[model samples]
Target: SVERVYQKKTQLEHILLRPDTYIGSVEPLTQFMWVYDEDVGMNCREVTFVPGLYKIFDEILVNAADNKQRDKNMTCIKVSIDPESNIISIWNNGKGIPVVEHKVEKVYVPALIFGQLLTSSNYDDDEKKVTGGRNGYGAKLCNIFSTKFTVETACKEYKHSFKQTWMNNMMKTSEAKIKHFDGEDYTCITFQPDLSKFKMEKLDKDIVALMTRRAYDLAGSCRGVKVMFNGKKLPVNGFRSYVDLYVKDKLDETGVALKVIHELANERWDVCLTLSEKGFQQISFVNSIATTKGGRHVDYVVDQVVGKLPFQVKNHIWVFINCLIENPTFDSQTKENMTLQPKSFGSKCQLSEKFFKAASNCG
Candidate 1:
């Protein structure tokens, strides 16, 4: 039958020769499957946690934070969020995205970053483990989901500006202007998320405050970071003041003595701990992404605490940890949980040993 079908000669004759095999039935197939870039845009908004608009901010912030690692000139990022106008702006003093045409795509590199995926330069670089936005979806997804997305950048040779709008679920980018910028380099992004697609049209102040405070803590240990929120300056003192700022009110009334534990181990992990009235809170992060639903690493710390401390002393300690690992696997794009069990770190017992060594010095 196969030889006969091939011998039928005409393309139409071959299809007719084995019509059932070709169409899965004697009758002509009619149904079709489809996909579009908008499929990704819709999935991004629908699948992640509620108030997905925050992701737009999170991705941009991480991009700015990572730029500091890549560009020697980058000092820090400055963010301005205004709920009144629903506009958020981020500026970083880093070498901007290249204004020259991309060799492969025949388009400016900035356009490639915001308009496409799998174009990040860090994908193959192990050194990028220390920086955020290791994945390629960072800026592009933000651009896709936002109603109005605009970006500007300047390097030694040129300055460029680009704006994009989502029309009928399709992205339309304006022609980018490439020119010289007086040898100065910087990057700026301003975007307003489309509230029409979300449950909440306005950004909550408390949520913004908490998010920025967490970011401030992440960048605090670094010397170059500067954070501003709604005309307010946040601490850049390496989580040193987080105790006073985050738990002081609880500490102010009917308060018990408070102590902060700060330690550096293996020159890779930075550990910070303090007691919080929030009850048994443990915050973990990989790079800049916060892990709200902590995994084995968080468990290891808890296990050691339970084993080493007196039974009566159980509970009521808040732990905060930030560390870097190569080829990390997060539970989801939201990265609320870190699911990897690092075999390189050794067995559970050995893992706890190092954690205990760090915890034992806690005051």
Candidate 2:
């Protein structure tokens, strides 16, 4: 077999979690390097049409929230087309990382970091359950792709910007690696995808714009976000354009568009969107993360959508929904060990009878 060489693999250095140590020959450079938890938590998604994957992606970012400032506005959510040169960025415009950083709030604590309370000094009383940097695994997932991955941020009113990159040796050893920076205030994260990790030759522009909108659905408070691919700006109008055309009416620019949500049982639902020529992007989030292979909730959302569709639209309609999948099936940290069966037609069950009927007509 022959291989066509492009970028020199030798020049591509890995970003290990600083604290990492390889076990002799058992470790390949691939093993030595890391892809941040965002990719891992979301199961290294390519495209999505499910609801769960979006939730997982949200969970990954939710942790980064500071204690007292848990109710911060999300800046933007992006789904880049070309992962190799593409970028996935989500920012929160909150009070910059607290200077003293102490809070007693712990509404959403994801275990594992309960130990931080014991060793914390006087700051112990200020302990909060929210763990943004709790495990450190999330940031490590950023290393998965892109030759360069960086985080740039600021808070309320800081003069300079806080910028940092995945240090070449940040992971080779983990004594306590800190992102060295000279700014203060806002927060921004930028990671260039590792071409080696993501191998699609062409870009999927429509799908890229699709999921980003869903991710940033509640955008009133959080300033508008922009997702760029290969230095080109992605448009927001493109997101609802296709859906608007499919609906047989011109969508109001100010109004938000909905695809379809069907229910299986009262507790769960499935929301799916298929592209024109491309395949499909399905996502399902039970509580937050992705229910990869799809889940009972997905089935529920589908069922609910079917029941609700008739009330929302005058006729039984066919719609589309595209998304960026998070924590794909068979690869989640937990719960996503099953296969999602695909069913044509419609789902069964109805919780919100009026809403259900209204949604059915959107098709």
Against the true structure, whose TM-score is highest?
Answer: 1
**CA lDDT for candidate 1:** 0.58
Task: Compute the lDDT of residue 6 as modeled in candidate 1.
Answer: 68
How accurate locally is residue 29 in candidate 1, as Cα lDDT from 0 to 100?
A: 24
TM-score of 2: 0.41
- Candidate 2 per-residue lDDT, tens place, 1-363, comes to 245654333212422221122101111122111011222211222342222222333433433333213433433333333444455564544444432223455411111121122221123323332222322334444433335555555443323334445533222211222343444344445554443333334223323433343333322101234433324444433333323333333232334354443322222232333221222233333322333355543443444444432433212333322222211232233333323233421233334555455444443
Candidate 2 C-alpha error for residue 318, in Å: 6.5
What candidate 1 gets wrong by more than 4 Å, as runs, is 1-49, 157-170, 218-223, 251-254, 275-279, 300-314, 344-363
Per-residue lDDT of 59-149 in model 1, one digit per residue for the tens?
8887787776677567667777776787878888867777777888998887777766567877885654366566786676566556777
**TM-score per candidate, chains pooled:** 0.72, 0.41
Candidate 1 clash pair list: 158-179
